Amino acid sequence: SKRVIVIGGALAETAFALGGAETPRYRLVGADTTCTYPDAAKRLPKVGYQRALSAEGLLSLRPDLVLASAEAGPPTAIAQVKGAGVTVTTFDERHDVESVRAKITGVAQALDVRDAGAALLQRFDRDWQAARDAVAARVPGGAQPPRVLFVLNHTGTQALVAGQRTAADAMIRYAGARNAMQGFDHYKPLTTEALAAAAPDVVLISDEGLAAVGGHAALLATPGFGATPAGRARRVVSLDALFLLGFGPRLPLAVTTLHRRLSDALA
Numbered sequence: 001s002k003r004v005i006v007i008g009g010a011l012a013e014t015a016f017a018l019g020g021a022e023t024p025r026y027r028l029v030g031a032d033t034t035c036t037y038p039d040a041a042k043r044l045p046k047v048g049y050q051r052a053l054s055a056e057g058l059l060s061l062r063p064d065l066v067l068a069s070a071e072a073g074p075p076t077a078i079a080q081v082k083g084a085g086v087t088v089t090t091f092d093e094r095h096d097v098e099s100v101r102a103k104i105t106g107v108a109q110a111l112d113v114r115d116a117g118a119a120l121l122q123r124f125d126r127d128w129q130a131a132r133d134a135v136a137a138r139v140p141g142g143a144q145p146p147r148v149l150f151v152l153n154h155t156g157t158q159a160l161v162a163g164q165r166t167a168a169d170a171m172i173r174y175a176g177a178r179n180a181m182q183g184f185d186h187y188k189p190l191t192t193e194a195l196a197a198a199a200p201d202v203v204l205i206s207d208e209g210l211a212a213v214g215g216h217a218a219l220l221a222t223p224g225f226g227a228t229p230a231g232r233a234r235r236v237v238s239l240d241a242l243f244l245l246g247f248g249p250r251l252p253l254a255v256t257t258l259h260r261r262l263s264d265a266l267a
């Protein structure tokens, strides 16, 4: 009965896994375009994109409650939605396990399925221990931690690269590798010099980013890749964007999948 909109794919994932989607107290009525999992989230109508929201886009679905990533914005749109008397409950994006725990627990609370939350949390904590043990047992590539560059270019308009304090940086480290980009936070444009300075062994990119530019050959013919080990060896790994970067209940499997795929590419 209370109308809910979720902003941030991980939060929608959590909401659905928890059976919080269609209950007598809370109905999920919309989401942003990062909400692609599970299939029920695909079906929700969309308000826009997490980081380029319009207040009207959100408000046209008449929400009573918004569950929102701390990275949702711009800030004026979030503030306009609160100013419209809508409750907005915000979740941190600290890119660690505590962040996912707070999503599981916080979404359970906001949606009033606390018990399903405790069961998912417990199951998550055990999967996570299994993921960490599997990574600790083998450095991907068999030698030193490989240098991994993350390319962010979801729509193909502008290739960006990941520095520190990003989901990508955290995922790279969790998977037993090192971020080839060092010395700045967040994202900056991909340039020939940024590639040469980073000298990656592997290029990581989302499935969607890779397909937006036309595939592996288009990516590697980008000027500057030829001077990098990853470019000479044509080493490109891709995962679904939400799965890789979302910091949701599938974090353990994402970390293990990224670990496995880095190893395959390096052997």
Ligand code: HEM
Pocket: 008, 009, 010, 033, 034, 049, 050, 051, 152, 154, 155, 162, 165, 166, 167, 168, 169, 187, 241, 242, 245, 246
């Ligand atoms: C100028 C355009 C865009 C910029 C600059 C951009 C920027 C970003 C950044 C900074 C992140 C977080 C990455 C990290 O922490 O490592 C991200 C995550 C993501 N973005 Fe975008 N983005 C753009 C467009 C899009 C569009 C159009 C979509 C989908 C239609 C998309 C889907 C995603 C997804 C699924 C994630 C990860 C999960 C999430 O954030 O909820 N982005 N984006």
